[PDB]
Structures are given as structure tokens and as C-alpha cells.
Amino acid sequence: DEVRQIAPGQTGKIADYNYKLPDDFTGCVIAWNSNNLDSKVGGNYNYLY
Amino acid sequence: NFMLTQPHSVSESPGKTVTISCTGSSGSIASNYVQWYQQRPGSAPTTVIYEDNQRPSGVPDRFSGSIDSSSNSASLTISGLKTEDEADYYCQSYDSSNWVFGGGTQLTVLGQPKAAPSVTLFPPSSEELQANKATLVCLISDFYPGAVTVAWKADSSPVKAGVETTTPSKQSNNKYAASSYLSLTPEQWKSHRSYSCQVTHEGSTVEKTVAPTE
Amino acid sequence: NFMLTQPHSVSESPGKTVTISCTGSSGSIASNYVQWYQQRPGSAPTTVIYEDNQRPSGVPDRFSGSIDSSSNSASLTISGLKTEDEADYYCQSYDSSNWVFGGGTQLTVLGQPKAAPSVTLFPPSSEELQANKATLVCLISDFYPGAVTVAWKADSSPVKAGVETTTPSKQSNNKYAASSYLSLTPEQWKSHRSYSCQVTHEGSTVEKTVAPTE
Amino acid sequence: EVQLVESGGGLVQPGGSLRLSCAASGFTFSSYWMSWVRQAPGKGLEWVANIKQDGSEKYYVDSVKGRFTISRDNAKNSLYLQMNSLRAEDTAVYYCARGQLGPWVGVDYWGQGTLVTVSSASTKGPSVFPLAPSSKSTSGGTAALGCLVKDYFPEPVTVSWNSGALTSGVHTFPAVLQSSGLYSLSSVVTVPSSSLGTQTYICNVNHKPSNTKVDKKVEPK
Amino acid sequence: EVQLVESGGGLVQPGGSLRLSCAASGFTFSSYWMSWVRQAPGKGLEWVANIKQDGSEKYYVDSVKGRFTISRDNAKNSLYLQMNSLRAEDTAVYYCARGQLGPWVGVDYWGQGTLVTVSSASTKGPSVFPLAPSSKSTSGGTAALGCLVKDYFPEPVTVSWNSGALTSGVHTFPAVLQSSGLYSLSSVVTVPSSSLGTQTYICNVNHKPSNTKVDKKVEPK
């Protein structure tokens, strides 16, 4: 859900309290999905935000 | 279930700036690149917009595009509105390892007021009647507008079954042509008096009469 | 092709104001009235919003609605976020002599942390094997959380085909219970050494071993 | 206050005919709008039909166009729904909807409904296997008892022990899906091991679609 | 400049196998992306498949999942497409798409394509009737000529006159639908009446689904 907040201009919990990008960003953003590797059958609880 | 929503017939205007809106519903279209494609009906398509802001080499700068994130829609704007060929346009995005295409947006519109219709009849020959099949075609052409009715008249009673008529088609004469087919049997062909096929137009009625005697 | 787009899981928050967006694509939803409906899973549904701005008698004032004609979206706002039962909501409009409904928007989340699992085995009896079928059930109960994997081990090679496992169910002990069924044949039952069914949990592994000698 | 009572389903049939009736009371039947609404189990809501206060105008969704028909009468205050040539998607619960002014104000009315499922596959009797664990140690989940139900279709199965004489300690595991889409479950009861020969343990299994009532004694091996 | 040549269609078959090949030149074959795109006649565009520059990864739409396969080779610079168990929906025009960097930049490449149509229940033989109007007056649409094609399935029919020697004044009327859903059309050519006996007229009718080519002489009655 919070992938479009990575782009500059947008606002949100992640975009303003954890990671903010400048309005003159001249780079690239790479995103992919990995559910089985990052989570076991019981779920992952070592991630903080 | 990613899809893209766009209208089907817009930009029907002469020579000013109009916009075309492409929007999605399942996800945000601003996450990935979206492009605009055009196709010529009857030949290969081309591309007017790639990379959501750029144009191919040789493509005129009249076209312009923009992205809004408030309504999550893609806008394609055409400035010149020249004598460009009629076409329809599509909207393409990419969700995950798959491609989605738009529905399509048609764009087509950027001496004698009365024409005499030419009517011709082809009665069955000896080759037809020996195969237990008689065909009588009621051909009409060069009429304007293409709103005509074709009916067949027998000796004493109009027929209803066995008459098939197709829609008029655009020929290379700035006119329309239509055809009607009738299937009958040889026993009634010789038992009648005079066959007739009549066509009706706006304030016009042309009737033809033939005889079975050959 | 009038249809209404709304998310499936939103408002997972404790006790503040959150809005839910319903939008359409084929036409403007502000032309006709749009309503908000709620359904109780396992029983009859009710209605929270009718006439796009009003609520039925007895419905609390916490719910409210609004219309944004710019974004072509309908907003439903819930204020209190009380202990209301788990439910999902739909969006309804009217285009022409037909009714359209929304996809659905689920809204659910508004003494010993470790329990020893009890595992029991039921080997086939003489009654089973004379009917040319052998059943071996691998029963587990009293585990928390209900995220376990059930596997079967033969004498020298784990099996892959013939093992079926159901989802855990809530019993009257504040715990979960699951069952696994295995279908084998008598010729391999006497050709093995020791059957084993293993269950893995959070930092725990219980292993049981039996013998065909009875 | 309005009663809405629906009883038109409860059987499976492929491509045949079924009649559904909704009973209504507490209001005038010939002044408002009524409709019909269905939903799939675990899926979303969808609209089926609507009818005018005199039955002059009726409309349907294009999926069921050609088939389906609806009739009404104001003398006995009832709704009739007939559908024919059913398909596997028709497993749904149906509510008789009631309007107030038209198709714009809202539905606001939904009965409890009747569960309607279709299945071309026929019913079949449950193979019962009352396992008797004569030799088993203590400190386990089940001391000494077992009854197994396998190879039955469809749900549910009425499972009883000793004709319902005892009910304490009865635990019935949920049905499991096999590789062929088949149901199987077991029920266990905690009883002392000293009553294996001094008490008659007998397992009652009832299947309503298959109309099979099989009653089997448990004997230790 | 990049040239794309496609020739894989031109015949009908229900539920069989068809192989399509696209020929490419003017660029390196083993460095960019290629795809496959089809469209229905009179409908919009839709995506079919895509392939990596080495053929390691291939993907399809859920409608054609299970069937379909794509193969490639960089030695001879060609693409192969195999379809099996075709349906009536597959009447489409296929273009071999070529990418630039990936599935995000765009397609930007489309060949001329090949017309592909599918008809079931095979076909029957067309009945050509080259009518000869020996006696007809002037001041009419057709002076003296006639050819009729009837009882054929499906569209289209390649109609020629005297093996394509003449092409001026040839007017082919569109096909008409009859009461049995049957196609029929006629083609007329304006020729002088003085050449009825001094010039040979042969009406050429070719049907690709029926693989029938019938040449008939027009003789006056």
C-alpha cells in the first residue's frame, strides 16, 4: 500500500516520518514482491517503523 | 484485475485543443509508465507517446500529454487537429508481469442533392433451373441517403418469406449500393403473370416489370 | 457496463475518523442516488445510509456520507469506530432499469502464551484392512498460534502424495485443533519399519514413532 | 414492523426447475416496489430482478436473460420466483427485496433468506469405521474410543453416540478435503478404559441426502 | 529501418494446431524484448504474450494459460508461435511486438500482421452460377455480364475474372445473410455487348477454407 508514498510530492506516514525524498530527485526506484522469503508460516515481527 | 477506462468517441471538433482522459481503478497508474498508441484502420499501428512525456522522431510536436495524481488519470491533448487520418487510440499500463490495453477511442470527423438509383434484375437462366434452384437478385445502387426498402410483388399477392436484404455499402462513387436476394421454385415461376421488384426512397418509387416468356 | 470500484480492506484502525471511497467509471454517480449497505456475515444485511445523506431510525449519528463530484467518488465516514460487529460494506447505484452492486470492503479488526500440543495416532485395525483400505489420521490439538505443518515420514523416504490437512478450528478451550488424513495400501504397511508423523510449530517439534507389530 | 419469510430451497439439481416463495406481512402489498437479490457464499452482492406493484413491468440482469420468471399476487401477499436450466454458479442465498418508492431510494429490506446449492454429483452413504483402540497407554488425548466417517457427500452428517445418551466429552473434528474433493471427519469421546467390556459403545451416523442410518457397535480387538 | 514479416495464417481449423512465424531484420535479435499482440476485427487491442531476449522467461494472459507456447532462436532471427485447442474467439490479427528495454517503456513496434480466422464444423462446397445475360438493352447498370456465388462458409471468397487479366469496372456486392444464416454475393463487370462471342469470360472463384478453385466459362443462352 505504501509504495506510491516513496515518490516525491506525496505525503503520508512513511513519506514524512520515516523516509522523505527531495522534490528534485533525478534517480530511479525499484520495487518487487517477496512474501515467502520475508515471512514464514507464523509471520514476521522483527520489523519496526 | 488491473484495467483502464477511457471513452470511445471524443475530440469531434475542428482545429482547437481538446483532451482525452485515461484512468484506472485497481491501482495507481502513476507508479508505472503509461503510453498512448494509435492505429490506422486497415493497416499497422504506430505510437505517439512513449515514456509518458516523450515523442518519436518524426512525430509532430502538436501532441501533448500530462499526468494528474489527484484523479489518477492520464491526459492526452492534441493541439493542431490537422487533416490526420481517422483512427482510434488505446491506453496501456503494466501491473505485474502482464500488459493491459484500453478499450479504444474512435476519432473520425476532424454536388447533386438527389441521385437517380440504378436498378438491375438478373432472372434465372437455364443453368439455374436444372439444379432445382432459381435466384432473382434485386440490385440497387447510387442512392442518397441510404434509406431504402426492397419488396417483391407477385401476380396477385406480395411475398414475405424468402426475401433477404443487406445493408448498403460505401463504394467509390460517393454513393451507396445494396442488394436483395430471393429464392423461389420453378413451379410458381411459370404459374405467375409478371414479376416485380419495387424500391422506395424519399419521395421516389421505381418499379420494374418482366415476363416469364423468354 | 456501469460498475462501482471500492477497496476490500480498509478502516483497520482503533477509534478515529476514517473514510471509505466508492467510485464509478462508466458514468457520473452524482446523477442518481447512491446508497451504502452493510451485511452481517451469517445473517441478514441492513442499511446504514440511504438518500446519499440520511440514516434510518435507530442508526447512530456516528456514520455520515458525502459526495465529491470532482473525483467522481462517494465517501462514507465513520466517526466513533465502536465495538460494532465484523462486517463488510457495498456500494449501489442505478444506471438504466438495472441495479449494480459494489465489490465489497471487509472490516474486521476494529493466560499461557505457549501451549503444549497433544498429538494422537489411530493406526488401522483388522476391520479396515479387510476392506482394502488403510487410514492413518494425525490429530493435533491445543496449539497457539494455529500455524503448524503436518508431515509423514516412512522408513527411508518422506511421502508427498495422499496427505490431506484441514485448517485449524476454534474449540471450547481457547485453542485450535487440526486433523490430517493419509491413505495408504497394506502391501507397503508391512514392508516398512516404523511409521512417523511430524508436526512443526514455533520453536517446537514433536515426533512420534510406532511399529507394524501388533 | 415487517416479517419476511423465505422457504424455497434445500435440494440439489442440475438444469431442472425450482420454485422459491417469499412470505411477507405487516404492510400493503400493492403500493410499493419489490425485488430479488442473491449473493454467493464468500463473495459479493449482486442484483437479480425487480417487479412493479402490479407486475406489469419486470426486469432482469443480462446473465439470466431469456430464462427466469417472476409472478405476484396481492390477495395472499406472496412472491413467486421460478428459474430453469440452472448452472453451477447458482449456489447462492436469495433474499426477497422490498422497495419504498423506486429503484433510486434504496433497498433497505432483506430477509433471512434460504440457502440454495446445486450439485450434479449424487449423494452417497458414509462408510463408517468405529475404530477400537483396545491397547493404548494413558496421558493421551483419547483414552480408548474411535469412530470414523469417510466417503460421504455432501455436508452435513449427524453424528451421535449411544443414541444421544452421553454428550460430555464429545469432540467432532471438522471435515477434510481430499485429493478427489471428498469429505472425511472423525469424532472422539473421552471414556475410561475400565468400561471397554462393561459398557456398550455404539456409533450413530446419519446422512440426510443419502437417507442412510447406520448403527454399529464398537468391539475391542 | 526495421522490417517485420508475418505469414502464419490463411486457413481455418477448430481445436487443432497452427504455427505462426514472424521474420525480423535490421537489428540485433538477442539484446531486446519481443512480445505478441492480437486484436479482434472491429474491437480493441489486447495483449497475448511476451518473451525475454534468451527465452528463459515467458508469460501469458490467464485466458490462454495452460495452452500456448513460444520459442525463439538468435541464429536465424525469427520468432515461433504455436497454438493448440483453438476456439471461435481466436479470430484475430496477430502482430509480433518488439520491445526496447522492458515491459515499461512501450511497444512502439507492430508488423503488418496476418489475417487469422477460425470456423468450426469444417465447410461445404460453394455453388458458382455465372449468369449470361445474352438479351439485355443498353442504359443499364451492367451491359452483359454476370457471376453469382452462393452456399459457402465462411468469409471471405477470392473472386477474380479471367485470371485477373482485367480489373477495370469490377464491382463486387457485399455478402447477404439469408434465413438460414447463409452468405451469398455477386460480382458484376461492365463490358461491351459486342464482345460476347469474340472474347472469353471466365469467372474465377477461390475459397481458402474449402480449398476449392473452380473456373467456369460464361456462355450466352
PDB file of N, CA, C and O in Angstrom, chain A:
ATOM      1  N   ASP A   1       0.825  -1.203   0.000  1.00  0.00           N
ATOM      2  CA  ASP A   1       0.000   0.000   0.000  1.00  0.00           C
ATOM      3  C   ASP A   1       0.862   1.257   0.000  1.00  0.00           C
ATOM      4  O   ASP A   1       0.573   2.220  -0.719  1.00  0.00           O
ATOM      5  N   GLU A   2       1.924   1.266   0.800  1.00  0.00           N
ATOM      6  CA  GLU A   2       2.795   2.436   0.927  1.00  0.00           C
ATOM      7  C   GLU A   2       3.991   2.366  -0.020  1.00  0.00           C
ATOM      8  O   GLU A   2       5.145   2.484   0.392  1.00  0.00           O
ATOM      9  N   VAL A   3       3.720   2.175  -1.308  1.00  0.00           N
ATOM     10  CA  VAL A   3       4.747   2.244  -2.340  1.00  0.00           C
ATOM     11  C   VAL A   3       4.671   3.556  -3.112  1.00  0.00           C
ATOM     12  O   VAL A   3       5.700   4.123  -3.480  1.00  0.00           O
ATOM     13  N   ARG A   4       3.456   4.055  -3.350  1.00  0.00           N
ATOM     14  CA  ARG A   4       3.290   5.344  -4.011  1.00  0.00           C
ATOM     15  C   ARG A   4       3.734   6.508  -3.132  1.00  0.00           C
ATOM     16  O   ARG A   4       3.956   7.608  -3.650  1.00  0.00           O
ATOM     17  N   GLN A   5       3.869   6.293  -1.821  1.00  0.00           N
ATOM     18  CA  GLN A   5       4.359   7.342  -0.934  1.00  0.00           C
ATOM     19  C   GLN A   5       5.860   7.561  -1.073  1.00  0.00           C
ATOM     20  O   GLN A   5       6.371   8.582  -0.601  1.00  0.00           O
ATOM     21  N   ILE A   6       6.574   6.622  -1.699  1.00  0.00           N
ATOM     22  CA  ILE A   6       8.007   6.787  -1.927  1.00  0.00           C
ATOM     23  C   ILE A   6       8.269   7.925  -2.907  1.00  0.00           C
ATOM     24  O   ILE A   6       9.270   8.643  -2.782  1.00  0.00           O
ATOM     25  N   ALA A   7       7.384   8.111  -3.883  1.00  0.00           N
ATOM     26  CA  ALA A   7       7.563   9.159  -4.877  1.00  0.00           C
ATOM     27  C   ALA A   7       7.499  10.537  -4.218  1.00  0.00           C
ATOM     28  O   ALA A   7       6.705  10.746  -3.292  1.00  0.00           O
ATOM     29  N   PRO A   8       8.329  11.485  -4.650  1.00  0.00           N
ATOM     30  CA  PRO A   8       8.280  12.832  -4.073  1.00  0.00           C
ATOM     31  C   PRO A   8       6.970  13.535  -4.390  1.00  0.00           C
ATOM     32  O   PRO A   8       6.351  13.313  -5.433  1.00  0.00           O
ATOM     33  N   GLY A   9       6.552  14.397  -3.466  1.00  0.00           N
ATOM     34  CA  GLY A   9       5.308  15.124  -3.615  1.00  0.00           C
ATOM     35  C   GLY A   9       4.191  14.547  -2.772  1.00  0.00           C
ATOM     36  O   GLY A   9       3.398  15.289  -2.184  1.00  0.00           O
ATOM     37  N   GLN A  10       4.119  13.220  -2.706  1.00  0.00           N
ATOM     38  CA  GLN A  10       3.109  12.563  -1.894  1.00  0.00           C
ATOM     39  C   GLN A  10       3.463  12.665  -0.411  1.00  0.00           C
ATOM     40  O   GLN A  10       4.627  12.807  -0.028  1.00  0.00           O
ATOM     41  N   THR A  11       2.431  12.589   0.426  1.00  0.00           N
ATOM     42  CA  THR A  11       2.584  12.690   1.868  1.00  0.00           C
ATOM     43  C   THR A  11       1.932  11.491   2.541  1.00  0.00           C
ATOM     44  O   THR A  11       0.990  10.895   2.010  1.00  0.00           O
ATOM     45  N   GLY A  12       2.445  11.145   3.714  1.00  0.00           N
ATOM     46  CA  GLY A  12       1.923  10.015   4.453  1.00  0.00           C
ATOM     47  C   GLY A  12       2.774   9.744   5.677  1.00  0.00           C
ATOM     48  O   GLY A  12       3.652  10.533   6.034  1.00  0.00           O
ATOM     49  N   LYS A  13       2.486   8.609   6.318  1.00  0.00           N
ATOM     50  CA  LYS A  13       3.252   8.214   7.497  1.00  0.00           C
ATOM     51  C   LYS A  13       4.694   7.884   7.129  1.00  0.00           C
ATOM     52  O   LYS A  13       5.635   8.367   7.768  1.00  0.00           O
ATOM     53  N   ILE A  14       4.886   7.060   6.099  1.00  0.00           N
ATOM     54  CA  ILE A  14       6.236   6.711   5.669  1.00  0.00           C
ATOM     55  C   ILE A  14       6.917   7.895   4.990  1.00  0.00           C
ATOM     56  O   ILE A  14       8.115   8.130   5.191  1.00  0.00           O
ATOM     57  N   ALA A  15       6.170   8.664   4.195  1.00  0.00           N
ATOM     58  CA  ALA A  15       6.765   9.720   3.381  1.00  0.00           C
ATOM     59  C   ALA A  15       7.265  10.901   4.203  1.00  0.00           C
ATOM     60  O   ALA A  15       8.125  11.647   3.723  1.00  0.00           O
ATOM     61  N   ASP A  16       6.759  11.095   5.423  1.00  0.00           N
ATOM     62  CA  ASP A  16       7.125  12.254   6.222  1.00  0.00           C
ATOM     63  C   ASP A  16       7.733  11.923   7.577  1.00  0.00           C
ATOM     64  O   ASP A  16       8.327  12.814   8.195  1.00  0.00           O
ATOM     65  N   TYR A  17       7.610  10.686   8.062  1.00  0.00           N
ATOM     66  CA  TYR A  17       8.139  10.329   9.372  1.00  0.00           C
ATOM     67  C   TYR A  17       9.270   9.313   9.325  1.00  0.00           C
ATOM     68  O   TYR A  17       9.989   9.173  10.319  1.00  0.00           O
ATOM     69  N   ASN A  18       9.446   8.604   8.214  1.00  0.00           N
ATOM     70  CA  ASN A  18      10.485   7.588   8.100  1.00  0.00           C
ATOM     71  C   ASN A  18      11.449   7.828   6.950  1.00  0.00           C
ATOM     72  O   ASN A  18      12.656   7.631   7.116  1.00  0.00           O
ATOM     73  N   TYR A  19      10.956   8.250   5.788  1.00  0.00           N
ATOM     74  CA  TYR A  19      11.809   8.447   4.621  1.00  0.00           C
ATOM     75  C   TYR A  19      11.181   9.506   3.729  1.00  0.00           C
ATOM     76  O   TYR A  19      10.045   9.338   3.275  1.00  0.00           O
ATOM     77  N   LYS A  20      11.918  10.585   3.478  1.00  0.00           N
ATOM     78  CA  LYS A  20      11.454  11.687   2.647  1.00  0.00           C
ATOM     79  C   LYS A  20      12.416  11.874   1.483  1.00  0.00           C
ATOM     80  O   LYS A  20      13.637  11.847   1.673  1.00  0.00           O
ATOM     81  N   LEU A  21      11.864  12.054   0.277  1.00  0.00           N
ATOM     82  CA  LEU A  21      12.672  12.284  -0.909  1.00  0.00           C
ATOM     83  C   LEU A  21      12.562  13.736  -1.361  1.00  0.00           C
ATOM     84  O   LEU A  21      11.494  14.345  -1.224  1.00  0.00           O
ATOM     85  N   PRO A  22      13.637  14.317  -1.890  1.00  0.00           N
ATOM     86  CA  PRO A  22      13.571  15.706  -2.355  1.00  0.00           C
ATOM     87  C   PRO A  22      12.733  15.839  -3.619  1.00  0.00           C
ATOM     88  O   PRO A  22      12.519  14.884  -4.368  1.00  0.00           O
ATOM     89  N   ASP A  23      12.255  17.066  -3.846  1.00  0.00           N
ATOM     90  CA  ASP A  23      11.400  17.353  -4.993  1.00  0.00           C
ATOM     91  C   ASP A  23      12.166  17.412  -6.309  1.00  0.00           C
ATOM     92  O   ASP A  23      11.532  17.461  -7.369  1.00  0.00           O
ATOM     93  N   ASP A  24      13.496  17.409  -6.273  1.00  0.00           N
ATOM     94  CA  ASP A  24      14.329  17.426  -7.471  1.00  0.00           C
ATOM     95  C   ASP A  24      15.084  16.108  -7.633  1.00  0.00           C
ATOM     96  O   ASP A  24      16.265  16.084  -7.985  1.00  0.00           O
ATOM     97  N   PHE A  25      14.398  14.998  -7.370  1.00  0.00           N
ATOM     98  CA  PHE A  25      15.024  13.685  -7.420  1.00  0.00           C
ATOM     99  C   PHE A  25      15.249  13.256  -8.866  1.00  0.00           C
ATOM    100  O   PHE A  25      14.316  13.242  -9.674  1.00  0.00           O
ATOM    101  N   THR A  26      16.494  12.906  -9.190  1.00  0.00           N
ATOM    102  CA  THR A  26      16.895  12.516 -10.538  1.00  0.00           C
ATOM    103  C   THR A  26      17.390  11.074 -10.570  1.00  0.00           C
ATOM    104  O   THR A  26      18.365  10.749 -11.251  1.00  0.00           O
ATOM    105  N   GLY A  27      16.724  10.189  -9.835  1.00  0.00           N
ATOM    106  CA  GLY A  27      17.130   8.798  -9.790  1.00  0.00           C
ATOM    107  C   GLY A  27      16.036   7.827 -10.187  1.00  0.00           C
ATOM    108  O   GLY A  27      15.113   8.186 -10.923  1.00  0.00           O
ATOM    109  N   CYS A  28      16.132   6.589  -9.704  1.00  0.00           N
ATOM    110  CA  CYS A  28      15.172   5.543 -10.025  1.00  0.00           C
ATOM    111  C   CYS A  28      14.776   4.799  -8.758  1.00  0.00           C
ATOM    112  O   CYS A  28      15.531   4.753  -7.783  1.00  0.00           O
ATOM    113  N   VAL A  29      13.579   4.217  -8.782  1.00  0.00           N
ATOM    114  CA  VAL A  29      13.043   3.442  -7.668  1.00  0.00           C
ATOM    115  C   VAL A  29      12.704   2.048  -8.177  1.00  0.00           C
ATOM    116  O   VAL A  29      11.996   1.903  -9.181  1.00  0.00           O
ATOM    117  N   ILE A  30      13.209   1.027  -7.487  1.00  0.00           N
ATOM    118  CA  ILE A  30      12.997  -0.369  -7.856  1.00  0.00           C
ATOM    119  C   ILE A  30      12.220  -1.046  -6.735  1.00  0.00           C
ATOM    120  O   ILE A  30      12.622  -0.979  -5.568  1.00  0.00           O
ATOM    121  N   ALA A  31      11.112  -1.696  -7.090  1.00  0.00           N
ATOM    122  CA  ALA A  31      10.267  -2.373  -6.118  1.00  0.00           C
ATOM    123  C   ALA A  31       9.830  -3.724  -6.664  1.00  0.00           C
ATOM    124  O   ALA A  31       9.512  -3.849  -7.850  1.00  0.00           O
ATOM    125  N   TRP A  32       9.814  -4.730  -5.791  1.00  0.00           N
ATOM    126  CA  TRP A  32       9.347  -6.061  -6.154  1.00  0.00           C
ATOM    127  C   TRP A  32       8.691  -6.702  -4.939  1.00  0.00           C
ATOM    128  O   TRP A  32       8.776  -6.192  -3.820  1.00  0.00           O
ATOM    129  N   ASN A  33       8.035  -7.835  -5.175  1.00  0.00           N
ATOM    130  CA  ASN A  33       7.280  -8.546  -4.151  1.00  0.00           C
ATOM    131  C   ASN A  33       8.028  -9.803  -3.731  1.00  0.00           C
ATOM    132  O   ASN A  33       8.486 -10.573  -4.584  1.00  0.00           O
ATOM    133  N   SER A  34       8.150 -10.006  -2.418  1.00  0.00           N
ATOM    134  CA  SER A  34       8.780 -11.211  -1.876  1.00  0.00           C
ATOM    135  C   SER A  34       8.085 -11.530  -0.556  1.00  0.00           C
ATOM    136  O   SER A  34       8.446 -10.978   0.487  1.00  0.00           O
ATOM    137  N   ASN A  35       7.097 -12.423  -0.609  1.00  0.00           N
ATOM    138  CA  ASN A  35       6.295 -12.780   0.556  1.00  0.00           C
ATOM    139  C   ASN A  35       6.788 -14.035   1.264  1.00  0.00           C
ATOM    140  O   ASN A  35       6.805 -14.076   2.498  1.00  0.00           O
ATOM    141  N   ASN A  36       7.183 -15.065   0.511  1.00  0.00           N
ATOM    142  CA  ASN A  36       7.623 -16.311   1.132  1.00  0.00           C
ATOM    143  C   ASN A  36       8.976 -16.151   1.818  1.00  0.00           C
ATOM    144  O   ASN A  36       9.219 -16.758   2.869  1.00  0.00           O
ATOM    145  N   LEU A  37       9.868 -15.346   1.239  1.00  0.00           N
ATOM    146  CA  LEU A  37      11.199 -15.183   1.814  1.00  0.00           C
ATOM    147  C   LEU A  37      11.165 -14.319   3.069  1.00  0.00           C
ATOM    148  O   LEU A  37      11.845 -14.621   4.057  1.00  0.00           O
ATOM    149  N   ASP A  38      10.378 -13.246   3.054  1.00  0.00           N
ATOM    150  CA  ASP A  38      10.349 -12.286   4.151  1.00  0.00           C
ATOM    151  C   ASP A  38       9.377 -12.666   5.260  1.00  0.00           C
ATOM    152  O   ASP A  38       9.338 -11.979   6.287  1.00  0.00           O
ATOM    153  N   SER A  39       8.597 -13.731   5.090  1.00  0.00           N
ATOM    154  CA  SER A  39       7.632 -14.131   6.106  1.00  0.00           C
ATOM    155  C   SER A  39       7.501 -15.645   6.113  1.00  0.00           C
ATOM    156  O   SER A  39       7.353 -16.263   5.055  1.00  0.00           O
ATOM    157  N   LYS A  40       7.551 -16.233   7.306  1.00  0.00           N
ATOM    158  CA  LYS A  40       7.362 -17.665   7.473  1.00  0.00           C
ATOM    159  C   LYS A  40       5.877 -17.961   7.684  1.00  0.00           C
ATOM    160  O   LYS A  40       5.014 -17.107   7.463  1.00  0.00           O
ATOM    161  N   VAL A  41       5.565 -19.190   8.102  1.00  0.00           N
ATOM    162  CA  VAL A  41       4.174 -19.580   8.314  1.00  0.00           C
ATOM    163  C   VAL A  41       3.566 -18.827   9.496  1.00  0.00           C
ATOM    164  O   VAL A  41       2.353 -18.581   9.527  1.00  0.00           O
ATOM    165  N   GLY A  42       4.386 -18.426  10.469  1.00  0.00           N
ATOM    166  CA  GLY A  42       3.897 -17.712  11.631  1.00  0.00           C
ATOM    167  C   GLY A  42       3.907 -16.205  11.529  1.00  0.00           C
ATOM    168  O   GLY A  42       3.336 -15.533  12.391  1.00  0.00           O
ATOM    169  N   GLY A  43       4.539 -15.654  10.499  1.00  0.00           N
ATOM    170  CA  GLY A  43       4.618 -14.220  10.330  1.00  0.00           C
ATOM    171  C   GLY A  43       5.883 -13.628  10.927  1.00  0.00           C
ATOM    172  O   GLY A  43       6.533 -14.207  11.795  1.00  0.00           O
ATOM    173  N   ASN A  44       6.225 -12.437  10.445  1.00  0.00           N
ATOM    174  CA  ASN A  44       7.462 -11.765  10.821  1.00  0.00           C
ATOM    175  C   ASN A  44       7.148 -10.580  11.727  1.00  0.00           C
ATOM    176  O   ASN A  44       6.274  -9.767  11.411  1.00  0.00           O
ATOM    177  N   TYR A  45       7.869 -10.481  12.851  1.00  0.00           N
ATOM    178  CA  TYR A  45       7.623  -9.436  13.839  1.00  0.00           C
ATOM    179  C   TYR A  45       8.894  -8.702  14.255  1.00  0.00           C
ATOM    180  O   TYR A  45       8.901  -8.040  15.299  1.00  0.00           O
ATOM    181  N   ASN A  46       9.971  -8.795  13.476  1.00  0.00           N
ATOM    182  CA  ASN A  46      11.209  -8.098  13.798  1.00  0.00           C
ATOM    183  C   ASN A  46      11.360  -6.786  13.037  1.00  0.00           C
ATOM    184  O   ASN A  46      12.453  -6.212  13.020  1.00  0.00           O
ATOM    185  N   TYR A  47      10.291  -6.303  12.412  1.00  0.00           N
ATOM    186  CA  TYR A  47      10.327  -5.109  11.582  1.00  0.00           C
ATOM    187  C   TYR A  47       9.694  -3.948  12.336  1.00  0.00           C
ATOM    188  O   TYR A  47       8.590  -4.074  12.877  1.00  0.00           O
ATOM    189  N   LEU A  48      10.398  -2.819  12.372  1.00  0.00           N
ATOM    190  CA  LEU A  48       9.999  -1.668  13.165  1.00  0.00           C
ATOM    191  C   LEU A  48       9.799  -0.459  12.260  1.00  0.00           C
ATOM    192  O   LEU A  48      10.488  -0.300  11.247  1.00  0.00           O
ATOM    193  N   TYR A  49       8.847   0.396  12.633  1.00  0.00           N
ATOM    194  CA  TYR A  49       8.549   1.594  11.861  1.00  0.00           C
ATOM    195  C   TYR A  49       7.976   2.658  12.787  1.00  0.00           C
ATOM    196  O   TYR A  49       7.508   2.362  13.889  1.00  0.00           O
TER     197      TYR A  49
END
